[PDB]
Design a protein around this ligand. Structure first.
Ligand SMILES: O=C(O)Cc1noc2ccccc12
Ligand SMILES: O=C(O)Cc1noc2ccccc12
Ligand SMILES: O=C(O)Cc1noc2ccccc12
Ligand SMILES: O=C(O)Cc1noc2ccccc12
Lengths: 150, 150
């Protein structure tokens, strides 16, 4: 069911890790800076996400997180179906790659306004989600609202 | 404009601080554990919130955050109108008090499943936002904002 599908994405900058969740149908994202991508960090990020949006299915970003007992525990707790993130359609991976580049670009554009990387990442989340193309933020709300009325 | 109005709420547990943002019209919340309520922590929390939902107006939780230059900078950056949180209608404060009690109760009910308080708080956020009262707070916020976009 399209409304509930999210994709995990892990990218790197300034020797740190940026963990991203993308709502596939809308392009809407949430993101956090973590010291490194562990099962525990990924599990906590998914718990936060699922408390905030109706997360039905997650395409995990790699096999370590797919295997992780802590990630599996979080998915069980929050009612998330954990799936692999293998792009059976290969245009999927190019879209994520492009987004990581887009996000890094925005981070560079705001980097001066923020002392800490985590502030710059949240500025980038804001700009990404508000960007008129409707915005991603508008699309996710419309998609989920339409789904609730069924 | 009702769709964009949020209220900040700071409550305490286990010698730590839980910062909550409530979407007034729906009862939907986001929350985080912080070591203490500083301007900088509050500013960052508001930036995160406004990147994720269309935050137009925030009723700040106290005068220190209302005054804070860092909070004012975040509100300017994110396009948020900062207002005081004085309950000109006094039933407002009782609703927040009740929610803090409700959240603490849920935290107690899950506390055993979580090693860290921050995990228990996000479990409580999840349970609060999914609770059917019939629609949930998560369903209501999406419906309110979708109606407003159109
Ligand atoms: O128990 C913890 O604090 C580890 C943890 N971090 O995130 C979680 C999500 C679900 C279940 C457990 C966790
Ligand atoms: O994109 C907008 O300007 C309005 C908006 N509508 O819904 C949103 C959700 C998240 C973020 C922003 C929004
Ligand atoms: O990293 C900083 O510059 C401080 C900061 N923390 O959170 C913010 C939000 C908006 C603007 C600035 C900040
Ligand atoms: O509350 C629900 O069961 C589904 C739901 N619909 O929209 C939401 C937004 C946030 C969290 C949960 C939801």
């Amino acid at each position: 069911s399209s409304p509930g599908i999210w994709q995990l994405d892990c990218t790197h900058l300034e020797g740190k890790v940026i963990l991203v969740a993308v709502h596939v149908a809308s392009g809407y994202i949430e993101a956090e800076v973590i010291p490194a991508e562990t099962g525990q960090e990924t599990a906590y990020f998914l718990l936060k996400l699922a408390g905030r949006w109706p997360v039905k299915t997650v395409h995990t970003d790699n096999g370590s997180n797919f295997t992780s007992t802590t990630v599996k525990a979080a998915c069980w707790w929050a009612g998330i179906k954990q799936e692999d993130g293998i792009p059976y359609n290969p245009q999927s991976q190019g879209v994520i790659e492009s987004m990581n580049k887009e996000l890094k670009k925005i981070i560079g554009q705001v980097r001066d306004q923020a002392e800490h990387l985590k502030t710059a990442v949240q500025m980038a989340v804001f700009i990404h989600n508000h960007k008129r193309k409707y915005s991603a933020g508008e699309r996710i709300v419309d998609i989920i609202a339409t789904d609730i009325q069924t």
